[PDB]
Design an enzyme around this catalytic site. Structure first.
Site, PDB file in Angstrom:
ATOM      1  N   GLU A   1      84.988 -55.443  94.145  1.00 53.74           N
ATOM      2  CA  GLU A   1      84.273 -55.574  92.797  1.00 53.74           C
ATOM      3  C   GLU A   1      83.842 -57.063  92.200  1.00 53.74           C
ATOM      4  OE1 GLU A   1      83.081 -52.365  90.907  1.00 53.74           O
ATOM      5  OE2 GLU A   1      84.658 -51.076  91.301  1.00 53.74           O
ATOM      6  N   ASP A   2      83.106 -57.790  92.972  1.00 55.27           N
ATOM      7  CA  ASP A   2      82.783 -59.183  92.749  1.00 55.27           C
ATOM      8  C   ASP A   2      83.815 -60.206  92.720  1.00 55.27           C
ATOM      9  OD1 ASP A   2      80.016 -57.991  92.977  1.00 55.27           O
ATOM     10  OD2 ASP A   2      79.577 -58.690  91.199  1.00 55.27           O
TER      11      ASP A   2
END
Ligand SMILES: [Zn+2]
Ligand SMILES: [Zn+2]
Ligand SMILES: [Zn+2]
Lengths: 134, 114, 65, 266, 46
Positions: A3-4
């Site tokens: 997630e980034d």
């Protein structure tokens, strides 16, 4: 790295990958309040000075400034100032509590009308940590 | 700032043993050794050697979280055989294997002219 | 600014190789790719260190005090 | 001879190409890990700055000084200051280096790892010498000064490992490969038309027999035979990166055997 | 010995005290610096 988020080579970080210099500059004036009241650059003494900062004043030379080269830290007093009113309250400048580093340079000047004022540069080296954005 | 000291990876803490051997409840003749200030370097090495031991029924290790340099190694052996002894033998075998590896490298290096 | 000692990715000293690289280009006229390789910089991690360096120090020196 | 065997392919001051047969992949790797991380080295660890008129920051320079490789041949007869009995450092636990540089020249004055001088007593041991591999014999370029640019500082070099800081990393890249023909089926080759045409053949393919399509999959087959290349930075000679690596891992295992031994007492 | 303040441009040392005149001796320029502490600073080389 989900997630980034990303993983960094801690080995590379040591070798200088993404390090950076950081310079903050603190300013202060010696203001003149009318015919009599004048602020002063000095090392405040805790007996005759009110509302002192809990931080330490020891790193101040008698001109009220830290000499460049001294290492500082949170809450410590970079610039000593008092606003005489009567004996005198404490108007000193402490380093940001969330930061630290070594004083880079300190300059003394007068301005357009000739008010003594002093600029202090503080250098830190910021080495890529966890929540650091790229 | 919230960064732990780098030596914390290898230097044992105040009152903290390298090994902590606790017995497995869920299985007979099974134990759990927690290795403090250690990583994969040693874990996977030991686990793989215990696998070579015929009298060893179960062997696995896990680094429960990467912020901490420690790993839990679970050893299960056949009845009568002690898991501490199993670990002792695998440890020994590894050393003796490395001893030959050094000897063999040294001999081969000395033969080179560069 | 100022050549990195050691390649970030593998840590092969790259600090010595700077002037030598810059020389193999002016004095030897050689292309960048051969000079790097001459200097034994084989892995691209090491290559990128020298190939993509910007020696800002040289501008910094242009100011008096 | 005995257990696992070595067969050196090429040697130099900087590289060791070899073949490690009759070994567990786990062992080959554990050795590879140790060489990178756990072999001790000497490296600058404290930098007291007396004067710096340079375009660079005190700590910017300080950082570089740690990355300068120092002679760590006799590193084994030096104590870790942590284990040493003094107050901070001493001879038994450190090497003191000095650096005084000044722009006398109208032209740019350079500061090199050669400009470092040992001030501490060496006890006649091979230690703290800035490693110079440089053809012109200068070593690492630390700084550039103009005219009145002075740099006066003091370095305390200490014994350490790469786990604490990558500056104490005696090895550069360690090359490591096995099964150049994917006989073990340890990788599923990504391709577009043909994995054989698309993926480049390894050097080591020559040192192994091609699989020959008209044969069933060897499941029984296991991973032994590892084609490695150990590259040194300078601190320790290439051979000693391998040897000391083998020895560190051996010592590391002995500690466990010993730990168990002390536990048997109660 | 002792250089209380330095000059910004000509780099000539000044050593002045309180109410002495914030200016340099020869050049005009009221800039002026501070000169490093004599209390030598030590850094970890990491
Ligand atoms: Zn590299
Ligand atoms: Zn000592
Ligand atoms: Zn002037």
């Amino acid at each position: 790295n989900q997630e980034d988020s990303m993983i960094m080579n801690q080995s590379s970080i040591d070798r200088g990958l993404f390090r950076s210099l950081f310079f903050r500059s603190y300013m202060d004036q010696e203001k003149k309040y009318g015919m009599s009241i004048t602020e002063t650059f000095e090392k405040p003494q805790r007996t005759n000075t009110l509302r002192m900062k809990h931080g330490t004043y020891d790193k101040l030379d008698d001109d009220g400034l830290i000499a460049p080269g001294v290492r500082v830290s949170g809450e410590d007093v970079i610039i000593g100032k008092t606003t005489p009113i009567s004996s005198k309250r404490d108007a000193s400048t402490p380093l940001r509590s969330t930061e630290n580093g070594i004083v880079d340079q300190v300059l003394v000047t007068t301005n357009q009308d000739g008010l003594k004022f002093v600029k202090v540069r503080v250098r830190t080296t910021k080495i890529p940590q966890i929540g650091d954005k790229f | 700032m919230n960064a732990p000291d780098r030596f914390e990876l290898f230097l044992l803490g105040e009152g903290e043993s390298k090994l902590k051997i606790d017995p497995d409840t869920k299985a007979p003749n099974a134990v759990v050794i927690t290795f403090e200030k250690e990583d994969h370097t040693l874990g996977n090495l030991i686990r793989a050697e215990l696998l070579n031991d015929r009298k060893v029924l179960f062997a696995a290790y896990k680094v429960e979280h990467p912020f901490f340099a420690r790993f839990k190694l679970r050893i299960q052996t056949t009845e009568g055989y002690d898991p501490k002894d199993a670990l002792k033998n695998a440890c020994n075998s590894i050393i003796n294997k490395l001893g030959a590896l050094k000897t063999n490298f040294e001999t081969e290096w000395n033969l080179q002219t560069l | 600014m100022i050549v990195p000692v050691r390649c970030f990715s593998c840590g092969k000293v790259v600090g010595d190789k700077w002037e030598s690289y810059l020389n193999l280009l002016q004095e030897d006229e050689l292309d960048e790719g051969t000079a790097l390789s001459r200097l034994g910089l084989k892995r691209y991690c090491c290559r990128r260190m020298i190939l993509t360096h910007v020696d800002l120090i040289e501008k910094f020196l242009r100011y008096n005090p | 001879e005995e257990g696992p065997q070595v067969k050196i392919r090429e040697a130099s001051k900087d590289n060791v190409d070899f073949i490690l047969s009759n070994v567990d992949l786990a062992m080959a790797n554990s050795l590879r890990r140790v060489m990178i991380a756990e072999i001790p080295t000497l490296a600058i660890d404290s930098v007291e700055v007396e004067t710096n008129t340079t375009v660079l920051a005190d700590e910017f320079i300080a950082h570089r000084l740690g990355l300068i490789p120092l002679q760590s041949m006799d590193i084994e007869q030096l104590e870790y200051s942590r284990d040493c009995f003094c107050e901070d450092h001493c001879d038994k636990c450190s090497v003191v280096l000095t650096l005084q540089a000044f722009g006398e020249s109208e032209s740019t004055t350079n500061v090199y790892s050669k400009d470092l001088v040992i001030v501490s007593n060496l006890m006649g041991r091979n230690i703290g010498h800035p490693i110079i591999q440089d053809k012109e014999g200068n070593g690492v370029l630390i700084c550039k000064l103009r005219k009145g640019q002075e740099l006066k500082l003091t370095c305390v070099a200490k014994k350490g490992i790469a786990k604490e800081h990558a500056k104490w990393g005696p090895a550069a890249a360690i090359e490591f490969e096995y099964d150049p023909w994917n006989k073990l089926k340890h990788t599923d080759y990504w391709y577009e038309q043909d994995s054989a045409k698309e993926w480049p053949q390894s050097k080591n393919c020559e040192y192994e027999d091609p699989p020959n399509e008209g044969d069933p999959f060897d499941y029984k087959a296991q991973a032994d035979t590892f084609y490695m290349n150990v590259e040194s930075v300078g601190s320790i000679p290439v051979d000693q990166v391998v040897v000391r690596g083998i020895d560190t891992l051996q010592k590391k295992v002995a500690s466990i055997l010993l730990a168990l031994t002390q536990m048997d007492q109660d | 010995a002792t250089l209380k303040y330095i000059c910004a441009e000509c780099s000539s040392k000044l050593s002045l005290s309180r109410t002495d005149a914030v200016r340099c001796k020869d050049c005009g320029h009221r800039i002026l610096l501070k000169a490093r502490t004599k209390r030598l600073v030590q850094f970890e080389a990491r």
